[PDB]
Design a protein around this ligand. Structure first.
Ligand code: HG
Length: 224
């Protein structure tokens, strides 16, 4: 038990406006560190149909682009590729000890498939909860590491539905000022609607939610 007080602040049968949720969500993220805020949606698509799949990018108005300090962990000539692409910090596995000793001045981590065993094994504990672990479908692990770095630097994050017909993406951290959070949430919804597939029939956004790492979900009105 660590949530009776957390359950009293949210009405489960209420559809909140994006601004109310933006303010409310900050009070649900009363946990350690800076909690990642995500928007989740149930889409009106047939997930087994390739012509009804949703994949795209959203340029969020706050938090991304240049200002993001990217740490790239790689091996061989991939370190050179990462340097050429402009990652803020680049290192081989030797840099894991630096993070272990308390170094943490980066906002995002990208890595090549070959350093992941050691990365996930030595840092899954620290980075995992903070939402900083490179992950194949978060698009932060791949051999085309120069491309990954340039995308984030450009301020774009990718999204795609999963096999259950759900989709989601991080839109900020709990500490963000509510108006910035609200701006980012609206930006993701606008991007998502512009990606409604041709033949999708019926309601596209069946229900939309805002949530933190390990908190209750808040249902929101996508058109507020
Ligand atoms: Hg996720």
């Amino acid at each position: 038990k660590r949530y009776r007080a957390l359950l009293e602040k949210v009405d489960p049968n209420k559809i909140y406006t994006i601004d109310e949720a933006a303010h409310l969500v900050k009070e649900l993220a009363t946990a350690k560190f800076d909690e990642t805020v995500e928007v989740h949606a149930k889409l009106g698509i047939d997930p087994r149909r390739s012509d009804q799949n949703v994949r795209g990018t959203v340029s969020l108005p706050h938090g991304l682009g240049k200002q993001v300090r990217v740490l790239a962990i790689a091996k061989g000539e991939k370190i050179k590729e990462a340097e050429e692409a402009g990652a803020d910090y680049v290192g081989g596995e030797e840099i894991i000890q630096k993070i272990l000793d308390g170094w943490m001045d980066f906002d995002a981590v990208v890595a090549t498939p070959d350093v992941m065993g050691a990365v996930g094994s030595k840092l899954g504990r620290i980075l995992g909860p903070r939402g900083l672990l490179p992950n194949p479908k978060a698009g932060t692990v791949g051999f085309n590491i120069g491309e990954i770095i340039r995308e984030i630097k450009a301020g774009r994050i990718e999204f795609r539905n999963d096999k259950t017909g759900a989709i989601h993406a991080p839109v900020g951290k709990a500490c963000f000022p509510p108006e910035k959070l609200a701006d980012n949430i609206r930006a993701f919804i606008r991007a998502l609607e512009a990606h409604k597939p041709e033949g999708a029939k019926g309601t596209f956004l069946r229900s939309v939610y805002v949530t933190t790492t390990m908190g209750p979900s808040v249902r929101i009105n996508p058109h507020s």
